[PDB]
Design a protein around this ligand. Structure first.
Ligand SMILES: *[C@@H]1O[C@H](CO)[C@@H](O[C@@H]2O[C@H](CO)[C@@H](O)[C@H](O)[C@H]2NC(C)=O)[C@H](O)[C@H]1NC(C)=O
Ligand SMILES: *[C@@H]1O[C@H](CO)[C@@H](O[C@@H]2O[C@H](CO)[C@@H](O)[C@H](O)[C@H]2NC(C)=O)[C@H](O)[C@H]1NC(C)=O
Ligand SMILES: CC(=O)N[C@@H]1[C@@H](O)[C@H](O)[C@@H](CO)O[C@H]1O
Ligand SMILES: *[C@@H]1O[C@H](CO)[C@@H](O)[C@H](O)[C@H]1NC(C)=O
Ligand SMILES: *[C@@H]1O[C@H](CO)[C@@H](O)[C@H](O)[C@H]1NC(C)=O
Ligand SMILES: *[C@@H]1O[C@H](CO)[C@@H](O)[C@H](O)[C@H]1NC(C)=O
Ligand SMILES: *[C@@H]1O[C@H](CO)[C@@H](O)[C@H](O)[C@H]1NC(C)=O
Ligand SMILES: *[C@@H]1O[C@H](CO)[C@@H](O)[C@H](O)[C@H]1NC(C)=O
Ligand SMILES: *[C@@H]1O[C@H](CO)[C@@H](O)[C@H](O)[C@H]1NC(C)=O
Ligand SMILES: *[C@@H]1O[C@H](CO)[C@@H](O)[C@H](O)[C@H]1NC(C)=O
Ligand SMILES: *[C@@H]1O[C@H](CO)[C@@H](O)[C@H](O)[C@H]1NC(C)=O
Ligand SMILES: *[C@@H]1O[C@H](CO)[C@@H](O)[C@H](O)[C@H]1NC(C)=O
Lengths: 49, 48, 48, 255, 383, 48, 48
């Protein structure tokens, strides 16, 4: 009926607790918001199911 | 069905020991991967 | 293809110019790993 | 002083399987509760190791060293005391000498001219309540020399009511010579002991030479002992570290 | 405030009724720890750089530097070095690290040939007498020594090797001078046609050109942050503190975390222990040999519950996966990445299974689910 | 964006330290070509 | 066409000229004249 809800913090996965990595990750634009948005969509769909 | 986390209160002091070394749930959590709980508890599914 | 997989080793061993060439590879590979995982999860979610 | 005491004394090579040995801690990092994968020069599980046994008058052959070596001794009274490594062994090239003499270990790399039978000896219980190693009959010249080290006796001894086993691994990679070791008592007559253990790293040496062939050194005087040679190969192993962080089992990924 | 963070995350000035994820909170470090070994004597770079006479490149000489403090800024600030090029570190950072061994390799070559000392290169030096490994970590330091080292009719002590049956392995040293049988004929005796004495000398008079002149090379080589260290930069160590979030540095292994005494039993040759993700998770302190657990400083997801801007500016905050015995420690006695505190004032705090919800009052009446939190809990706006 | 698509051509014409930078491009583009194929195949498999 | 232009003028030793590149270190780059890491411009030098 459902599967586990997961959310992945893109900055903490990619750049774990470095600011000078986070300042490079910003140069890739929307991709971390797309990833959070997609996983939030899946997570809400599990309660809907 | 043996679950592998359900999001319930993994309150950091569990991830402060040899327990944290033997399980992957603390490694997932520390790398920004978090499981979240379902809206309906298994109580509410059992009631419905 | 970075000099180390651990982010803090790059940032301790290299200065602000040569470090950003190495950190960008880790960003590229890790961002490709998340977009892979989220593609697998979106396709899986359609089966569920 | 060195005298050419007769032939190689027949063909001593015996053979046996390496049941559960020649795995070692692959790097200087702690791990626990993990099945970890590592690729390097390892002794294969159940590999066909060569075996040599003392029976009187003995000789130790010249052996290859291709991609490094596993060496072990089953022993009482420390009959094996070192090794020579090189590609010529006759001063056309440098060569590496390791010895555990009665004062201490010595490590030395020089343009050595060895004697045809490099050996050592003891005079036994000669009134001083001691066993003096009065014979260093190993080499005859050492013209040019480029590294030397000395420290102490390597004698991890109660009274031998169970026989010793000493385990070593030798590698020669990117100009470093790498030595690993482990020791335990054992209680088998001749078979290599079935059971899991892994070697710790002991020394790393900046020698920077071609090693093609290797040898082992007998200490002379009733000493009964035997030694085994395996050859490492480039392989992948999976190691189970327990919660104490010791390699408690392994799988050879190509067995 | 949390509402402003949701507006910023949605990139909108109006927010609809719902629950929104926001930036993960994380307790920031309160002080810096440095722990290098307690070693005091300076490293003998004088013996390496002010040697009276260097080796020939066929017979390059290796010195081992240990148990000492290496102020690499002294070396790197010296304009004496025409080249000072580093391959797995940056020369600024050399003072912030400790190394398990340092090997200095000393030899003379032709200034135009210094280009071949770089790792993975090819040509007669890099092929036949001094090869760095492809993964080389260290610094190649090179300078012209013509005025000290050349002589008026010339200096001729400096052999290189012109032949070899094969390439050498990295950091190999070949002292053999046995005649190179280049032809099909065998060639015992000192020379023959198409059979060569394999070493031949550079010609160096002080008049010969830049690039053809004699250059002294030192190559420093070392390995980093997987083994017990013995050579160190001049960084002062500090009092080790535990059970607080801190910026640590052990032997150059910089990071951020909470330190604690472990029940882990590192073997004598180990200095770091690692987790599943290759991250270091325990360390042996180089001045009191106990093994310390490293844990990341406490963090979690923040999610903001809003009835929507058209209804109200009041919001409630879910610290997801957190027992709220910990959120009252995230008062401003230490810093956090989200600078807003506000809801941390308390009064209306409620532990859910999903984590702790702050700014919403708990009520015993059940209702239809309006905004879903998790684990049976929902929230809504009412009198 | 490599200088050639023939893998042995790269490994002949360039010496190793920059040949590996050319090989890194063919590895990246071919791995992206497989991640594309497998994504299409997974989405197709869901239709089938 | 450029929005504002500034010429910065000074004399140094010829071996110190390398320190005028952006992100460098050494006595001139450290305590004398530092360029920013995002410097847009040209560094021009001649033996005098
Ligand atoms: C021991 O015997 C060997 C021969 O088995 C001797 O080796 C020869 O030594 C002479 C010089 O004395 C050389 O001209 C020969 O070419 C050697 N033969 C070989 C096959 O190498 C050796 O010298 C003897 N040593 C002693 C101390 O008696
Ligand atoms: C939140 O954390 C506190 C401790 O900081 C937990 O309190 C302990 O709970 C156990 C089980 O009921 C008791 O044995 C202890 O005596 C309690 N200690 C204190 C200091 O109160 C609390 O249970 C945790 N809450 C949740 C939901 O996990
Ligand atoms: C490469 C090298 O060191 N060669 C020397 C050689 O010049 C010298 O004649 C000899 C004397 O024993 O020692 C060796
Ligand atoms: C391989 O092992 C067998 C014993 O199992 C032994 O008889 C044989 O001599 C070994 N092989 C070789 C090539 O010696
Ligand atoms: C052991 O070897 C070293 C080096 O040759 C020597 O100084 C020492 O005296 C030797 N000990 C004995 C017992 O000969
Ligand atoms: C006993 O030791 C002494 C040196 O202390 C030596 O001169 C003597 O020869 C030794 N005795 C025997 C019988 O070996
Ligand atoms: C781990 O070490 C402790 C203390 O030495 C010991 O009691 C325990 O038995 C060890 N674990 C195993 C699996 O033997
Ligand atoms: C060489 O000697 C001089 C004078 O003693 C000294 O100042 C200098 O620091 C030495 N060179 C190096 C590289 O330290
Ligand atoms: C080592 O010596 C052997 C025998 O002369 C030779 O086959 C091999 O090519 C040499 N290797 C090196 C790296 O010199
Ligand atoms: C370093 O110094 C402390 C005292 O400040 C001392 O207790 C410790 O034993 C020293 N380190 C070593 C490895 O002995
Ligand atoms: C909220 O929206 C309604 C229309 O749906 C409007 O009547 C009302 O005035 C709005 N409230 C505010 C505070 O803007
Ligand atoms: C809810 O009911 C419990 C008794 O089951 C009571 O202790 C608690 O105070 C009530 N909460 C409110 C908000 O009235």
């Amino acid at each position: 009926v459902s599967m586990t809800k997961t959310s992945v913090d893109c900055t903490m996965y990619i750049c774990g607790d470095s600011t000078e990595c986070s300042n490079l990750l910003l140069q890739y634009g929307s991709f971390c918001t797309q990833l959070n948005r997609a996983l939030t969509g899946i997570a809400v769909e599990q309660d809907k199911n | 069905v043996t679950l592998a986390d359900a999001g319930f209160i993994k309150q950091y002091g569990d991830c402060l020991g040899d327990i944290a070394a033997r399980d992957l749930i603390c490694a997932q959590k520390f790398n920004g991967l978090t499981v979240l709980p379902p809206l309906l508890t298994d109580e509410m599914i059992a009631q419905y | 293809g970075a000099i180390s997989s651990v982010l803090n080793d790059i940032l301790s061993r290299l200065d602000k110019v040569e470090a950003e060439v190495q950190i960008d590879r880790l960003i590229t590979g890790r961002l490709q790993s998340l977009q892979t995982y989220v593609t697998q999860q979106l396709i899986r979610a359609a089966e569920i | 002083q060195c005298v050419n005491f007769t032939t190689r004394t027949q063909l001593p090579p015996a053979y046996t399987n390496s049941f559960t040995r020649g795995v070692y801690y692959p790097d200087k990092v702690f791990r626990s509760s993990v099945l970890h994968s590592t690729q390097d020069l390892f002794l294969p599980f159940f590999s066909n190791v060569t075996w040599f046994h003392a029976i009187k008058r003995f000789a130790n052959p010249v052996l290859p060293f291709n991609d490094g070596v596993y060496f072990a001794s089953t022993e009482k009274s420390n009959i094996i005391r070192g090794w020579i490594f090189g590609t010529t062994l006759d001063s056309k090239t440098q060569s590496l000498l390791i010895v555990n003499n009665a004062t201490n270990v010595v490590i030395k790399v020089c343009e050595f001219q060895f004697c045809n039978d490099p050996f050592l000896g003891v005079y036994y219980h000669k009134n001083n309540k001691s066993w003096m190693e009065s014979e260093f009959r190993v080499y005859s010249s050492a013209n040019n020399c480029t590294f030397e080290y000395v420290s102490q006796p390597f004698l991890m001894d109660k009274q031998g009511n169970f026989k010793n086993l000493r385990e070593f691994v030798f590698k020669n990679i990117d100009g470093y010579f790498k030595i690993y070791s482990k020791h335990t008592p054992i209680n088998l007559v001749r078979g290599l002991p079935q059971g899991f253990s892994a070697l710790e790293p002991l020394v790393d040496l900046p020698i920077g030479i071609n090693i093609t062939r290797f040898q082992t050194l007998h200490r002379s005087y009733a000493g009964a002992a035997a030694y085994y040679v395996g050859y490492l190969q480039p392989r992948t192993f999976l190691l189970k570290y327990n919660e104490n962080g010791t390699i408690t089992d392994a799988v050879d990924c190509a067995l | 405030d949390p509402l402003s963070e949701t507006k910023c995350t949605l990139k909108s000035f109006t927010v609809e009724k719902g629950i929104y994820q926001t930036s993960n909170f994380r307790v920031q470090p309160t002080e810096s720890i440095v722990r290098f070994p307690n070693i005091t004597n300076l490293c003998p770079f004088g013996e390496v750089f002010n040697a009276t006479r260097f080796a020939s490149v066929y017979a390059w000489n290796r010195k081992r530097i240990s148990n000492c403090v290496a102020d690499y800024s002294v070396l790197y600030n010296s304009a004496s070095f025409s080249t000072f090029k580093c391959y797995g570190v940056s020369p600024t950072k050399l003072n912030d690290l400790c190394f398990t061994n340092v090997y200095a390799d000393s030899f003379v070559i032709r200034g135009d040939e210094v280009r071949q000392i770089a790792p993975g290169q090819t040509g007669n030096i890099a092929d036949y007498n001094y090869k760095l490994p492809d993964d080389f970590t260290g610094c190649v330091i090179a300078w012209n020594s013509n005025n000290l080292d050349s002589k008026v009719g010339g200096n001729y002590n400096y052999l290189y090797r012109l032949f070899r049956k094969s390439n050498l392995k990295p950091f190999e040293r070949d002292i053999s001078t046995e005649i190179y049988q280049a032809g099909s004929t065998p060639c015992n005796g000192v020379k023959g046609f198409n059979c060569y004495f394999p070493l031949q000398s550079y010609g160096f008079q002080p008049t010969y050109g830049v690039g053809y002149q004699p250059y002294r090379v030192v190559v420093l080589s070392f390995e980093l942050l997987h083994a017990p260290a013995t050579v160190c930069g001049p960084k002062k160590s500090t009092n080790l503190v535990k059970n607080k979030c801190v910026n640590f540095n052990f032997n150059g292994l910089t990071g951020t975390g909470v330190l604690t005494e472990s029940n882990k039993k590192f073997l004598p040759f180990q200095q770091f222990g690692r987790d599943i993700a290759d991250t270091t998770d325990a360390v042996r302190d180089p001045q009191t040999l106990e093994i310390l657990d490293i844990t990341p400083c406490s963090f979690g997801g923040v999610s903001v519950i809003t009835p929507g801007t058209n209804t109200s500016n009041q919001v409630a905050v879910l610290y997801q996966g957190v027992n709220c015995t910990e959120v009252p420690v995230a008062i401003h006695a230490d810093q956090l990445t989200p600078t807003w505190r506000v809801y941390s004032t308390g009064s209306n705090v409620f532990q859910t299974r999903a984590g702790c919800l702050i700014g919403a009052e708990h009520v015993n009446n059940s209702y239809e689910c309006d905004i879903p939190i998790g684990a049976g809990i929902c929230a809504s706006y009412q009198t």
